């Protein structure tokens, strides 16, 4: 991110004044925070990165051939609507580190019917042949009659299979936007959040992960899962992405969690 | 309320503690660690840092800036040049003489070398180097040295470089026209063109009046002359239009000059060609009437109500400005002299070779006095005010602007169309003379004379005057051409002024019969067509005149007074004074046929 | 009328201000040196402004420089030339071999 | 009444200022520390320095930068030049043709003048000027207007 | 004006350092002025502008064929001497703000033999011509029997013809300097303040001006009366101008008014 | 020395940080400090000056054809061996000002055999002859079996016998490390100081000295008298070298004094 010094005392200038909202200043002056993204920046397909720009910070775009993804207003609040449609994959490089890392995102259903939903997942073009050995992270949205389900999970063997991180998940209704989190560490271990407007629904933890449960490779694909087109596109919302290089679960980062949880509640919630 | 006195009687320093409370609580937040949060300032031993005599540190103790050992100050930081790191550079290549400007929005400009002109200088451009992203050349045209450096602008001009230590000074020799004879207005709510004046523009300073005309009401007819000694000019005072009487304005005589207004465009043009206003000094030098007799340095006479003649004045002014400018430290070199002349001599036949003396013999001073080496450009704008047998002044005028050593502007009859030579209206208790303009017309013909200095010098090009060459002569039928800088050339339906006959043109043989045009057209876009009322074949001294037609010879008024009808069919672009579109209409001319 | 409902509403700020009114006095009287101590520096995100790596702005927010994408610091404020802006310069000038 | 007017436009000012008076109080308690380790910065009357419009001077009062009335910023303290301040630089002279580079070590770099292929084009360098410690030069090669840099 | 940086810690640039009184400088930091001129830099003829400088200021030139004003050194101080023959004009530039402005001038009689004295009066190169539409400030000086009365007025529309704005007269002798203010502003009407060595002498004020003395132009001009080179001129001498862009009448300015006549006080009176 | 300017909110700057020693900034930073000699920085042959840099400050050369002087531990600690064999002059500058100056110096004796050993003396290659009228600084060390005294002089008319300064000398052991300080002033006196490892051992003043003891001259040599070479050369080892163009012996200085010494016995003392 670039850096802003102001100065006070020094010789005036002539070039229009250079403006930046105090939520800009707050959310990039947040401990660890590498990549954020906004679907305020969305555009033709393509998902720069906020906080790095477009040429330092990696840019999510469109992969499949289907209609692309456009912004849309729910309840007030722009969001990227993907209609099963999109497949947001990040080339190239990792998203996310896949040592220590946390990834809050918020999901918004605009009323759904497919019982599948899978907003994160593994890249369709993960170069090194992903196996057993090679577990990338995916989550699960499983829909019920009224009831939603997130389950964070560990790519198998096969890109679509999925190996589950928790044992019981709690459900959230079909018309309420949700903010998830997930953070690994080497030694603290998985957790993971999943907030809605009224209280924290879910709350997981598991200090105990084997070997098919962590996750060795960081590139994200958002809208789809692997190179499977068939069905279980996420149909919904998705709103600002936010990545840290450092797990806020972790005890001694509970102020910079508060304070990412709160601007999140009054900004989408 | 007591408060509410008390806060209604210190509301400012409220409103400044208002306007600064972000960093007053910033501050305050911090004062306790406000010791350890400031800048801290310590000597350490110069061992392995012997090169670097002072070193700027960031709080990673990284080096920022440091001090050589000769002065200079090096950035860790390298200082990212202003033609590679940010938008705008215009860089030259030599070919054939000719500077070519790369680097701009679209295909290359071209500024030729070798001048129009038969005493032009043949350039020889070098490239001197870069500065702010822009190419300086050095080029074997005299300035103030045997060669001048010059900046290439944003379209090509060759500015002048910018230095503190030199001054440009543009004269005004000549008759009234040049002094700013009854100029005082401009509009119905204005009387100058030019209220307020751009920085770094100076005239003389005088003991208690000072303006553009040194303070004298310099007049020939009039007895109420005056002159000033080198001891009584001083400095120099910022740049304004001044009117010498000081009385109302029904009774003031000169109130503003051409000097002004060319002074301040050319500030403005070296400004957006380099991004530096220059030193300009001006100084207007005359008297109104002289005849060219008078205005010569062997054989001249002496000004009524004077000691001295208008040379030895104009010496003597010269010298004190040199002076001056050699006392504060300056450099002094003449970039043009503006003149009008040819209203009181016209009838005398060998006005061209004393005008050429003349001009030579203030050049010749004018370089052995402020030290320069080359002749200060010369630009005159035709006078459009004589009698019928006044011709042989703008035949001299027409002939030295041949000969190289003048430059033409333009005529004075397209004030005739500007209100030039009087406004819409206003209250006039004296009669307003068509013969001297006013101050819309002093600055259109300011604005003229210092487009067309602006083309000599800059860009090495004189601008075409429209003009006769030649004509040919088939029975009753006349062809005559015309030279212009577009080559298509148009006859105006419906000008400001009135339609001078022929279209403005005249038929004189040397002849019994004399026959007059009858009829005038224009043919093709670059040759005219007259009509004779009978043919002149086999006659002798067949002469055809271009807005030479006169009939005053009581009182010039908008109908007598000689002018033109034919103009070019390009535009030079919109005026800067009126905001009306400018034109090259033609000078007035006479040429004999083939 | 409004203004003077605004009036009483904020009777209160006033009188707190007119309790420190000598304070607030003292304050104005040197804001030039309690300003000159609060410089900040706060990370922006970068989408927007890609060539400008580290921004430096005045009091009223203008950039003052700006290191672009290469590491090299540009100025808005053009610094003087030694030969144009001073008085002193040396021009060279090859005719017929030597140096003018 | 024009004191009434006075305090309604300057209401929001004085909300400002009531807002934080408690850091006012405790930066005016404590003026003596910050006036002894501030800047300062007051207007003075501009009689003889017209070229100069903002001054900049360090604490003995000696003038380090200054603005001209062009806008252009004027050190007092000379600016290192790069390739003279640091120990690499690179200038060119145009032999018959070739272009020979001078400021590398040992010897002088030679780029031909002339195309090594009958189709190319033939080069009359011309030294535009110097960059940062290099060479800046202008040749005939048309790249963008018949001109390259 | 000049702002002026005095960095703290910073380079030492090996040059002399630059010299400016402390009076300059208090005098340069009241809030609202915008012109002053001193007695030290007038120069024969020509009283430059000091705060805005000879390039920007506007110079008051003599406009007469006389012998020029000249500097005295009386009463113990320095002193713009006029014997009734000079005028001093700001050519083609307002001084004043019609809308609002504070016009504060240091004026010392030297023993009068006239009746009528005009030290400020409209200018005679006027581009509109100054009829009832187009007033302008005035000052006269009546003395009667070696009394003085100051009157602040508007031009009328013969332009030489002055109509009052204030009632009441009070007279000083003409044996001391005196200051001179007036004050206009929009929402606070008129102002007029004359202090002696002393005391005050006048305070005038003036809340609901007519048409016929509301100020319209700004263009001023000090020593004589226009058009009529008569018995009517300014034999006295202005040791100091100031004009402020705001009203310093007002409650407002009121804390800046107490420290501007405390320093003309200190050098003058 | 080297101004080393810190900021808190400048542009970083990608280098090795620039990292000096607290015990440099604390020595360079004594106030009228002028020159600092330390053994650290003694090349293989001559003696750069340390505050003033190579380039500026003065150069101890040895200047002798017999065995160049060497660096030794001794105790943990670093000294120039002068085993009689150096001769370090500084050639074509003045090390100490005549009128108000103060010479401190840190000397180990490392077992002495020798007698008589002159550690300071006048220039050899001087440009006036040292007379009566031209002397300058000698030190004096006289060995008893086993105990060492030191006494300052002035150089005498003949250029190597000296007038002494101060009268009684106390005894040290010639197995410990010593600093000797050495101050003078026009409006305070001689002053000598000599401290070991116990305390301080010495403690002379001349408050009233004669024109044969006031010095005149300016230049000193280290490790040799006068042009002898034979039996008078120093034996043992020396150490940090301060020479400050004040006087710490004076009654505003003294504060001063306590910060020197206390550095160099947390040195080598």
Chains 1, 5, 6 share one sequence.
């Not at chain 2, 040379?311 to 002076?323: E, F, G, H, S």
């Not at chain 2, 002094?332 to 002349?341: D, E, F, I, Q, Y």
Request: some cysteine; proline content about 5%; glycine content about 10%.
């Amino acid at each position: 991110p670039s850096t802003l010094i102001n100065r006070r005392i020094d010789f005036t200038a002539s070039g229009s004044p250079l403006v930046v909202s105090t939520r800009d200043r707050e959310i990039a002056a947040f401990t660890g925070l590498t990549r954020w993204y906004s679907p305020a920046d969305y555009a033709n397909g393509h998902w720069p990165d906020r906080l790095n720009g477009v040429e330092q910070g990696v840019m999510l775009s469109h992969s499949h051939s289907s209609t692309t993804p456009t912004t849309a207003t729910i309840g007030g609040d722009t969001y990227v609507n993907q209609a099963g449609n999109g497949r947001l994959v990040g080339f190239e490089q990792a998203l996310i580190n896949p040592s220590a890392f946390t990834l809050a995102f918020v999901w918004h259903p605009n009323g759904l019917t497919q019982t599948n939903n899978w907003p994160v997942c593994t890249a369709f073009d993960q170069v090194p042949i992903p196996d057993t050995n090679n577990r990338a992270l995916q989550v699960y949205m499983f829909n019920n009659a009224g009831n939603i389900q997130c389950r964070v999970s560990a790519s198998g063997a096969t890109g679509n299979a999925a190996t589950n991180i928790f044992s019981g998940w709690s459900t959230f209704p079909n018309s309420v936007p949700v903010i998830v989190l997930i953070g690994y560490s080497a030694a603290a271990g998985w957790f993971n959040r999943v907030i809605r407007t009224t209280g924290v629904v879910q709350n997981l933890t598991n200090a105990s992960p084997t070997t098919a449960q962590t996750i060795n490779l960081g590139r994200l694909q958002f809208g789809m899962l692997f190179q499977t087109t068939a069905s279980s596109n996420d149909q919904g919302a998705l709103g600002d992405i936010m990545v840290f290089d450092r797990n806020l679960f972790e005890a001694g980062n509970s102020a910079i969690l508060t304070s990412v949880i709160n601007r999140l509640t009054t900004d989408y919630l | 309320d007591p408060d509410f006195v008390a806060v209604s009687a210190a509301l400012t320093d409220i409103g400044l503690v208002a306007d600064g409370i972000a960093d007053v609580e910033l501050v305050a937040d911090n004062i306790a660690s406000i010791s350890s949060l400031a800048d801290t300032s310590a000597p350490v031993p110069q061992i392995g840092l012997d090169n670097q005599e002072r070193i700027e540190t960031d709080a990673a103790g990284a080096i920022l800036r440091s001090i050589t050992r000769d002065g200079r100050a090096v950035n860790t930081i390298p200082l990212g040049v202003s033609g590679l790191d940010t938008s705008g550079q215009r860089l030259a290549y030599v070919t054939g003489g000719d500077i070519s400007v790369i680097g701009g929005s679209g295909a290359a400009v071209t500024v030729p070398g070798v001048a129009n002109w038969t005493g032009g200088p043949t350039l020889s451009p070098q490239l001197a180097g870069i500065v702010d992203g822009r190419s300086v050349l050095t080029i074997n045209r005299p300035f103030a040295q045997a060669q001048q450096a010059v900046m290439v602008g944003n379209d090509g001009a060759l500015a002048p470089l910018p230095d503190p230590d030199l001054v440009h000074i543009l004269l005004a020799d000549g008759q009234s026209l040049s002094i700013g004879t009854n100029g005082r207005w401009f509009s119905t709510t204005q009387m100058h063109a030019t209220p307020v004046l751009p920085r770094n523009i100076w005239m003389l300073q005088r003991s208690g009046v000072s303006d553009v005309r040194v303070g004298r009401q310099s007049d020939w007819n009039a007895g109420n002359s005056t002159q000033v000694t080198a001891e009584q000019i001083l400095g120099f005072i910022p740049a304004g239009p001044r009117p010498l009487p000081n009385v109302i304005w029904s009774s003031v005589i000169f109130s503003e000059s051409i000097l002004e207004r060319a002074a301040k465009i050319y500030s403005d043009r070296v400004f957006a060609a380099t991004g530096r206003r220059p030193h300009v000094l001006i100084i207007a030098i005359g008297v109104g009437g002289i005849s060219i007799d008078n205005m010569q340095k062997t054989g001249a006479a002496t000004i009524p109500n004077t000691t001295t003649t208008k040379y030895d004045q104009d010496l003597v002014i010269l010298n004190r400005v040199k002076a001056l400018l050699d006392a504060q430290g300056k450099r002094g070199v003449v970039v043009g002299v503006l003149r009008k002349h040819g209203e009181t001599s016209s009838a005398d036949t060998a006005y061209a070779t004393k005008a050429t003396t003349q001009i030579n013999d203030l050049n010749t001073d004018i370089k052995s006095i402020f030290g320069q080496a080359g002749n200060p450009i010369w630009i005159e704008h035709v006078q459009s005010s004589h009698n019928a047998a006044g011709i042989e002044s703008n035949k001299a005028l027409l002939a030295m602007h041949l000969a190289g050593t003048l430059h033409l502007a333009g005529p004075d009859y397209q004030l005739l169309g500007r209100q030039g030579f009087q406004v819409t209206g206003v209250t006039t208790p004296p009669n307003p003379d068509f013969v001297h303009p006013t101050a819309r017309g002093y600055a259109i013909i300011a604005e003229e004379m210092i487009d067309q200095l602006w083309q000599v010098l800059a860009f090495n090009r004189r601008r075409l005057v429209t003009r006769a060459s030649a004509a040919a002569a088939s029975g009753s039928t006349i062809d005559v051409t015309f030279t212009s800088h577009s080559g298509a050339i148009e006859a105006v339906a419906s000008p400001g002024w009135t339609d001078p006959g022929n279209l403005g043109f005249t038929y004189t043989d040397s002849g019994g019969s004399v026959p007059t045009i009858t009829g005038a057209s224009v043919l093709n876009p670059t040759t005219v067509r007259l009509t004779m009322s009978a043919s002149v074949a086999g006659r002798s001294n067949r002469l055809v005149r271009y807005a030479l037609n006169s009939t005053a010879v009581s009182g010039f008024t908008a109908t007598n007074k000689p002018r033109g009808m034919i103009r070019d069919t390009t535009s030079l672009g919109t005026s800067e004074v009126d905001s009306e579109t400018r034109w090259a209409w033609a000078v007035p001319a006479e040429v004999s046929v083939t």
